[PDB]
Amino acid sequence: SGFRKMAFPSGKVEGCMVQVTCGTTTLNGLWLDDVVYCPRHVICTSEDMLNPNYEDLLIRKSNHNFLVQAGNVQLRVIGHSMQNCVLKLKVDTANPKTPKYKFVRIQPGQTFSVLACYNGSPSGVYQCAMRPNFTIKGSFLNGSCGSVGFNIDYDCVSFCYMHHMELPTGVHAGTDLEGNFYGPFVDRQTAQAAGTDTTITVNVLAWLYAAVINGDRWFLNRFTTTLNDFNLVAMKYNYEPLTQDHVDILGPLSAQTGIAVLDMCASLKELLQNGMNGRTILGSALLEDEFTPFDVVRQCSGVTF
Amino acid sequence: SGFRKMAFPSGKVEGCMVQVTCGTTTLNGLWLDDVVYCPRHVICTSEDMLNPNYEDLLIRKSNHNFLVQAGNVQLRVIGHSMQNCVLKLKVDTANPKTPKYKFVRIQPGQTFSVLACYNGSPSGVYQCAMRPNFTIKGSFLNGSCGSVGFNIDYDCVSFCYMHHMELPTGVHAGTDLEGNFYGPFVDRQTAQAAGTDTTITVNVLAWLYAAVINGDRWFLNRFTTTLNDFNLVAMKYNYEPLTQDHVDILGPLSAQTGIAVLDMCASLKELLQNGMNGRTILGSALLEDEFTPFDVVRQCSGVTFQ
Ligand SMILES: CC(C)(C)c1ccc(N(C(=O)c2c[nH]cn2)[C@@H](C(=O)NC2CCCCC2)c2cccnc2)cc1
Ligand SMILES: [Cl-]
Ligand SMILES: [Cl-]
Ligand code: NA
């Protein structure tokens, strides 16, 4: 029993992190097979970052403009190219620690583990969610660019995020590993801001189920509701609309606990309208929305990798 | 910017986790060099749980009664010995993935990462703190026994916790890697219960300093306090006493932010009195006590957002 924010074991990803230097800029890269992936803004000076022409900046660069360091070993760069906002550096040595992996683009509301790295050295691991506004509330300092987010399914690492920048509110933005940004962001020093965020409703419901599984039941009541009536409450409180697909995904937890989704929706409806009355749920005074239904089942069932 | 519960990268520990089976019982062990460490209660049967005599149970075992599995490889046990509540199995193969490591016993309030494992296979990583009542608020299911807690400051793995059992309130008890329990607990099924727990005051203060570093000052006030007056008030909210050692430990964070330790104590006194009035601190609506001063320095910038 107990319930914690839990990350995937990070060992398979630790063995892929390297340091990439171009000029005076140093950040992190991901070394898979014989290619290193990193943010393309590594090639920019501070002058360039105000209005970069990445096409022209890269054609200027050559293989010898890039220094790749794996621990204490130098990797020789034998080619370079760009895919969207990601720079790809071909090296002469395949990473012998390359895990089984895929590149996957995730949806808002889905979670992943972040391995925060500095100078190519892993520093920490934590769990995040892709916010509805396509930011993540990470923990990153200068030099963290190129840190990656991932999920694991058995022995296969699904890479879904590469870190690129911090926004003025202190939240973070990045790309998938094919270099496509999550959210309406660009890799240049210009005026950019996170949009107004919303709460991930299906995840809050999942966490309420986790609370019931762990013995927290005070918020349950005799009432049920309908999607239409609940979604009018959701819009009132800047909660994401609850779809029929979400109801189906929560089906398992509904069957296990005896609280139909629309039964639990009646609990959440009341929590939004009345508050918590000084009480906590799973040790929180806020409604937590960064656990997915999958996260709850995994942690309450002990799945291993 | 940002502030998260952050665990250490777990790879160095992943390469040490193995499965240990004795009879019908399976749990996790920690394979370092040519020794596998695991809870000695792996040798308990159904009716040995109330009053086992581990010396009598172990003398009846042969090396081949212990099955150790490292992924797909069976490891041959060539000896065994008990150290307090830990069983040490000598195997014929040294772990080629053994990291630089040391065994440390920690004090209440200290934090560490936990690699939760089942059947010798890692499942997840999270951060914990040793509570004042010598339990941890973990996330552990059946078969998690033998999962370990650790820190990795400066490329050296300091193992500080091995998981043994769950208490009636759902919190968790275990030992250091020398097999000595944290707290008054024993590896028997007899009625034991965690004591009334308290809040780790020095950690709450560290986390308030983190909030200031990150750019938030709304909770400060114009007052100060004596150390004794602070403790008189804080103990009425079931906070642990703040000692001069704690005040000294907070010195560097006080210097970075310009807020005297006893001025931050005055802010905490007011937060306990008033609540947050709909606000949050570092994303929380409660006062968080599982970040240590050392943790805050590790994660936060060395430059305050003024
Ligand atoms: C023999 C002894 C010391 C009484 C014991 C027995 C079982 C276990 N538990 C194993 O899961 C377990 C043991 N061997 C393989 N799995 C579990 C456990 O503590 N239930 C308690 C039930 C009440 C009485 C005390 C034990 C467990 C569950 C969840 C997370 N952590 C552990 C731990 C200790
Ligand atoms: Cl461009
Ligand atoms: Cl300590
Ligand atoms: Na209901």
Distance between alpha carbon B204 and the CA centroid of its chain, in Å? Answer: 17
Contact B104, B17 (CB under 8 A): no
Contact B133, B196 (CB under 8 A): yes
Q: Same structural domain for residues B1 and B150?
A: yes
Catalytic residue list of B: 41, 145
Token pair 């968790």 is found at B172
Ligand 1 pocket, residues with Cβ under 6 angstroms: B 25, 27, 41, 44, 49, 140-145, 165-166, 187, 189
**What residues have CB less than 8 Å from A178, skipping those under 6 apart?**
A83, A84, A86, A103, A105
Number of Cβ within 10 Å of residue B103's Cβ equals 13
Of the candidates B66, B99, B132, which is a domain's last residue?
B99
Contact B82, B40 (CB under 8 A): yes
| Residue A175, SS3 per DSSP | strand
Q: Which of A126, A151, A292 to mutate to test the interface with B (most CBs of B within 10 A)?
A: A126
| Per-residue tokens: B238 | 């079931």
Number of Cβ within 10 Å of residue A73's Cβ equals 9
Q: Same structural domain for residues B161 and B125?
A: yes
**What residues have CB less than 8 Å from A22, skipping those under 6 apart?**
A42, A43, A61, A65, A66, A67
| Per-residue tokens: A273 | 């309208």
Ligand 1 site-directed mutation target among B165, B187, B189, B192, most atoms within 8 Å of CB: B165
Contact B265, B205 (CB under 8 A): yes
Token pair 């003025």 is found at A168
Distance CA B251, CA B268 (A): 17
CATH of residue B247: 1.10.1840.10
Distance CA A6, CA A292 (A): 12
Residue B107 lies in a domain: yes
CA distances from A305 to A151, B123, B218 (A): 11, 6, 44
Q: Same structural domain for residues A23 and A84?
A: yes
Residue B283 lies in a domain: yes
End-to-end CA distance of chain A: 20
Contacts of A139 in chain B (CB under 8 A): 1-4, 6, 299
Distance CA A269, CA A233 (A): 7
The answer to whether residue A280 neighbours chain B at the CB level (below 8 Å) is: yes
Q: Which of B115, B126, B153 to mutate to test the interface with A (most CBs of A within 10 A)?
A: B126
Rounded to 5 degrees, φ, ψ at A87 are -95, 135
Of the candidates A56, A82, A99, which is a domain's last residue?
A99
Q: DSSP secondary-structure letter at B214?
A: T
Contact A173, A190 (CB under 8 A): no
Q: Same structural domain for residues A283 and A236?
A: yes
Catalytic residue list of A: 41, 145
The residues with which A20 forms a beta bridge, in sequence order, are A27, A68
**Cα–Cα–Cα angle for B71, B150, A298, nearest 5°?**
55
Q: Containing domain of residue B112, as a range?
A: 1-14+100-197
Of the candidates B68, B99, B130, which is a domain's last residue?
B99
Q: DSSP secondary-structure letter at B47?
A: G
Contact B178, B37 (CB under 8 A): no
Distance CA A207, CA A291 (A): 6
What's the domain count of chain B?
A: 3
The answer to whether residue B154 neighbours chain A at the CB level (below 8 Å) is: no
Q: Same structural domain for residues A133 and A56?
A: no
CA distances from B87 to A213, B40, B101, B145, B173 (A): 33, 5, 19, 13, 17
Q: DSSP secondary-structure letter at A163?
A: E
Rounded to 5 degrees, φ, ψ at A136 are -125, 145
Residue B211 lies in a domain: yes
- Closest residue in chain A to residue B141, using alpha carbons only: A1
Residue B306 lies in a domain: no
The residues with which A166 forms a beta bridge, in sequence order, are A172
**Cα–Cα–Cα angle for A71, A76, A82, nearest 5°?**
100
DSSP string, A247-280: HHHTHHHHHHHS--HHHHHHHHHHHHHH--TT--
Q: Same structural domain for residues A88 and A113?
A: no
Q: How far is the CA of A52 from the centre of ligand 2 (A)?
A: 6
Number of Cβ within 10 Å of residue A60's Cβ equals 10
CATH of residue B91: 2.40.10.10
Q: Same structural domain for residues B161 and B147?
A: yes
Nearest to B75 by CA among B93, B87, B57: B93
Structural method: X-ray
| Per-residue tokens: B121 | 């296979």
Q: Same structural domain for residues A72 and A210?
A: no
Determine which residue's CA is closest to atom 20 belonging to ligand 1: B166
Contact B165, B224 (CB under 8 A): no
Rounded to 5 degrees, φ, ψ at A184 are -85, 55
Q: Do B299 and A139 touch (CB under 8 A)?
A: yes
Contacts of A8 in chain B (CB under 8 A): 124-125
CA distances from B74 to A51, B19, B68, B114 (A): 59, 10, 6, 25
Nearest to B34 by CA among B95, B117, B100: B95
Stretch 35-94 of chain A: residues touching chain B, C-beta under 8 Å = none
| Residue A91, SS3 per DSSP | strand
Residue B6 lies in a domain: yes
Determine which residue's CA is closest to atom 15 belonging to ligand 1: B143
Declared resolution, Å: 1.7
| Per-residue tokens: A203 | 């995840």
Distance CA B185, CA B171 (A): 12
Angle between helices A201-213 and A293-301 (to 10 degrees): 20
Rounded to 5 degrees, φ, ψ at B104 are -130, 145
Q: Same structural domain for residues B158 and B10?
A: yes
* E strand or H helix that includes residue A300: helix A293-301
| Residue B159, SS3 per DSSP | strand
Q: Same structural domain for residues A163 and A146?
A: yes
Distance CA B175, CA B165 (A): 10
Q: Same structural domain for residues A9 and A21?
A: no
Residue type, B194: A
Distance CA A166, CA A174 (A): 9
Q: How far is the CA of A14 from the centre of ligand 3 (A)?
A: 27
Contact A166, A140 (CB under 8 A): yes
Stretch 6-35 of chain B: residues touching chain A, C-beta under 8 Å = 6-12, 14-15
Nearest to A2 among B15, B121, B137 (CB): B137
Q: Same structural domain for residues A9 and A105?
A: yes
Contact A39, A187 (CB under 8 A): yes
Q: Do A10 and B9 touch (CB under 8 A)?
A: yes
Contact A68, A123 (CB under 8 A): no
* E strand or H helix that includes residue B20: strand B17-22
On the 0-12 / 13-18 / 19+ scale of CB atoms within 10 A, A178 is middle
